[PDB]
Amino acid sequence: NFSCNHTMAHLFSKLSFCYLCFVSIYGLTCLYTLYWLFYRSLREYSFEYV
Amino acid sequence: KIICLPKRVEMKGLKTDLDLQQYSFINQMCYERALHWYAKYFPYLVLIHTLVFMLCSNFWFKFPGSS
Amino acid sequence: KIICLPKRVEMKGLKTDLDLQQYSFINQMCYERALHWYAKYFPYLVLIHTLVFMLCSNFWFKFPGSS
């Protein structure tokens, strides 16, 4: 039986938490683009202003 | 680095009468055994995911046919 | 680096009959436990705050729409 510990763990955990946040924002970004990809039907564009 | 000690045993000293070589052996053994695989691979895991994201972002222009 | 010793005990030497491995283990343990989290994160804390200040200063010109 052995009790052991490695140094980075707590720090890593904290780091990992923050890292997850970044990924979350990343995903949110894609969603908006995806909605912008799937709400405007960018296949046909009419100027109607020029 | 993993530091390991035996678990089960006025408070005096608690020498384990074990040499440095045994300590290093135990550190390696328990590091391979007890430590979680993801806990050890997290840096490489994140690096690989970021590299794949960068590659799939840049392949839009790196593909000559549409480039 | 944290140096740790047991607290409670002609003055002679006070050998603790503990090996180097135990000393390193105790240093790691008390460093994780006793040392204040902000005391340890202060360099990264200052780095992050300065980076955020720089980013919010530079985004004025880094946003192409107004750039």
Write a three-state SS string for chain A: CEEEEECCHHHHHHHHHHHHHHHHHHHHHHHHHHHHHCCCCCCCCCCCCC
Three-state secondary structure readout of chain B? CEEEEECCCCCCCCCCCCCHHHHHHHHHHHHHHCCCHHHHHHHHHHHHHHHHHHHHHHHHHHCCCCC
B7 to chain A nearest CA, in Å?
5
Q: Which two tokens stand for residue A34?
A: 């995806």
Among candidate residues C66, C22, B45, the one with its CA nearest the CA of residue A20: B45
**8 Å CB contact of A10 and C32:** yes
Which of B1, B7, B42 is facing A2, going by the closest CB pair? B7
Number of C-alpha atoms within 13 angstroms, CB side, residue B48?
5
Q: Which chains have 3 or more CB–CB distances shorter than 8 Å to chain C?
A: A, B
Q: Could you tell me the resolution of this structure in angstroms?
A: 4.6
In whole angstroms, give the CA distance from residue B19 to residue C21: 9
Q: E strand or H helix at C12, and its extent?
A: none
Instruction: Please tell me the experimental approach by which this structure was elucidated.
Output: cryo-EM
- Which residues in chain A are contacts of C32 at CB distance < 8 A? 5, 10
**8 Å CB contact of C19 and B14:** no
A7 lies within 8 A of chain C by CB: yes
Which of A2, A9, A19 is facing B46, going by the closest CB pair? A19
